């Protein structure tokens, strides 16, 4: 079993995505977090489930939702969630 960790950049992504969505619909933001959370925890037992990313070598992409992708990687000791991004737009940004 590999434990699931998040990089702080991925938690920032998460903070920014749920914040922006909740300015329109807070229940949708909460629904999205529940999807993301549910995509990620089975990686603990099946870390190689998702395809290796062709745009970022060394990571894998979950298409969690038609608008959101989770980028993650499998280390010696853990599954690391690296970023959560919008699938079509360059969002979340800056910081």
């Amino acid at each position: 079993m590999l434990p699931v960790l998040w990089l702080e950049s991925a938690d920032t992504d998460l903070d920014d995505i749920t914040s922006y969505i909740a300015r329109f619909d807070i229940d949708a933001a909460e629904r999205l977090w529940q999807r993301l959370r549910g995509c990620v925890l089975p990686l603990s037992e099946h870390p190689y489930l998702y395809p290796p990313s062709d745009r970022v070598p060394g990571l894998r992409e979950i298409v969690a939702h038609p608008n959101y992708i989770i980028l993650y990687r499998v280390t010696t000791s853990s599954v690391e969630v690296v970023n959560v991004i919008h699938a079509r737009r360059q969002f979340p940004l800056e910081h």
Binding site: P3, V4, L5, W6, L7, E8, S9, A10, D11, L14, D15, T18, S19, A22, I26, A29, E30, W33, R37, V40, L41, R55, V56, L59, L71, S78, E80, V82, N83, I85, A87, R88, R89, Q90
Partner: protein, 61 residues
């Protein structure tokens, strides 16, 4: 650039796809350069929990 069918690509042009992909590579490179260690998943849940709670208090006031 060349326009793409909404059924061939999730991007509208090849220019926008290349810009996105370079942006994403840059984002990932920043992410992995951050010195701070990774946090357990359940700490992410704890923070998510408290942010939603905060938003709901603020929304009711």
């Amino acid at each position: 650039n060349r326009a793409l069918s909404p059924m061939v690509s999730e991007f509208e042009t090849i220019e926008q796809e290349n810009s996105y992909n370079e942006w994403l590579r840059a984002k990932v490179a920043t992410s992995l350069a951050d010195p701070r260690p990774a946090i357990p998943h359940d700490e992410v849940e704890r923070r998510m929990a408290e942010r939603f709670a905060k938003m709901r208090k603020e929304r009711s006031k």
